[PDB]
């Protein structure tokens, strides 16, 4: 679909039996989710935002469904004010910025 | 244009006389530029995201020109590590997310 920016680009994601609300963020390199448990081993990592750095726990090749478009990839969880779908999973569903 | 997400969506804008490279971002509520000295009255404010809050000087009715589409709106000048174009202004050129 085409989404406009009068409102926040917020969409429903299925990340394995759970429905979540996340922002389609092209200003984000990665995908960071609010603290949840996702099956698998995790590596502790470090991303940064406008506020500075935060420690994350890194989960690899995890399937996410974004408004029925399928993606599979790195998905990070930590202390984010919202759930952001980064450019890493956006490219998999093929999203582009039009204007 | 039609911009892809394989690389950060960096574009040229012009502020004051400054010709700059800003990041297009659907995950930004506001536009944030790194320190620069624009003439004008301002108000401080705090903007946040991964890593917490940072203080910024808020300028009103500032003409900007994003890849040949001009706009006018609010602009936050603060110690941010990238120039960011938020939906405040994306909405004015007619940027859309499409997948």
């Amino acid at each position: 679909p085409q989404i406009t920016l009068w409102q926040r680009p917020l969409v429903t994601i299925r990340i394995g039996g759970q429905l979540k609300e996340a922002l389609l963020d092209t200003g984000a390199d990665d995908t960071v989710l609010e603290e949840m448990n996702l099956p698998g081993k995790w590596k502790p990592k470090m991303i940064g935002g406008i506020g500075g750095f935060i420690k994350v726990r890194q989960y690899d090749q995890i399937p996410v469904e974004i408004a029925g478009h399928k993606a599979i990839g790195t998905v990070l969880v930590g202390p984010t004010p919202v759930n952001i779908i980064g450019r890493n999973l956006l490219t998999q569903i093929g999203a582009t910025l039009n204007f | 244009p039609q911009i892809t997400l394989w690389q950060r969506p960096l574009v040229t804008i012009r502020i004051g006389g400054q010709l700059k490279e800003a990041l297009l971002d659907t995950g930004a509520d506001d536009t944030v530029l790194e320190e620069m000295n624009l003439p004008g009255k301002w108000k401080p404010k705090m903007i946040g995201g991964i890593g917490g809050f940072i203080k910024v000087r808020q300028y009103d009715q500032i003409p900007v020109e994003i890849a040949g589409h001009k706009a006018i709106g609010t602009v936050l000048v603060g110690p941010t590590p990238v120039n960011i174009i938020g939906r405040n202004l994306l909405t004015q050129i007619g940027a859309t997310l499409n997948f």
Partner: peptide, 6 residues
């Protein structure tokens, strides 16, 4: 990485 504004 960098991950972006509220």
């Amino acid at each position: 990485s960098l991950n972006x504004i509220x």
